Design a protein around this ligand. Structure first.
Ligand SMILES: CCCCCC
Ligand SMILES: [Ca+2]
Length: 223
């Protein structure tokens, strides 16, 4: 997260870290056995780390659980990032408590202007590289589709939305992918892509979760 702030230990209980010997993508716990992330984060040998603050130190509250199955959306397109969503089934159910909790799926889509919380352990430098040990947070409003499509002409699909600041300085970044965009206690987006990080006139693009609520429920129900 570029231009964000330290969330504080376990203040974002639904945030997960996708680990393969290092942190590569974020995720959101939606129930005791399922995590939602980005399709472009897919990789074999994933271990889901719950209750994390400092990802480089064991401080207590962590739960390491192996991914039992990763379901990339069948219509995911790696070139356009359309349908950039993936479900991860945990080998065993997580123990829910104060430090580890699930986030709710939206009932309706969010409107332009809705303020959301974006979090992750991604790069904190727009021009350069710096990875944090602890979880960073950022408050960002959902932008209007007109401004979004104006920023990325012909690249925004009905399954994406822009969130952030057109003046730059605050945005998600590499390493934040797959992470949650929570608005009014509802998971509205998944960190997907952007042109660089915190660049002027180049907001972050996120997977529009409200379009997939039925897909999620049906897939989970049959697996
Ligand atoms: C990282 C412990 C072994 C499985 C991959 C994290
Ligand atoms: Ca830790």
């Amino acid at each position: 997260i570029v231009g964000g702030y330290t969330c504080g230990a376990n203040t974002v209980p639904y945030q997960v870290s996708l680990n393969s010997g290092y942190h590569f993508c974020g995720g959101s716990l939606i129930n005791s056995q399922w995590v939602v992330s980005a399709a472009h984060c897919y990789k074999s040998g994933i271990q889901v780390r719950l209750g994390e603050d400092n990802i480089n130190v064991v401080e207590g509250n962590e739960q390491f659980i192996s991914a039992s199955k990763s379901i990339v959306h069948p219509s995911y397109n790696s070139n356009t990032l359309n349908n950039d969503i993936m479900l991860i089934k945990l080998k065993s159910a997580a123990s829910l408590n104060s430090r580890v909790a699930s986030i709710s799926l939206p009932t309706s889509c969010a409107s332009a202007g809705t303020q959301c919380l974006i979090s992750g352990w991604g790069n904190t430098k727009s021009s350069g590289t710096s990875y944090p040990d602890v979880l960073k947070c950022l408050k960002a409003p959902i932008l209007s589709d007109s401004s979004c499509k104006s920023a990325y002409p012909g690249q925004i699909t009905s399954n994406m939305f822009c969130a952030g600041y057109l003046e730059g300085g605050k945005d998600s970044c590499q390493g934040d992918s797959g992470g949650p965009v929570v608005c009014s206690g509802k998971l509205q987006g998944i960190v997907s892509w952007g042109s660089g990080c915190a660049q002027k006139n180049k907001p972050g693009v996120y997977t529009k979760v409200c379009n997939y609520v039925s897909w999620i429920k049906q897939t989970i129900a049959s697996n």
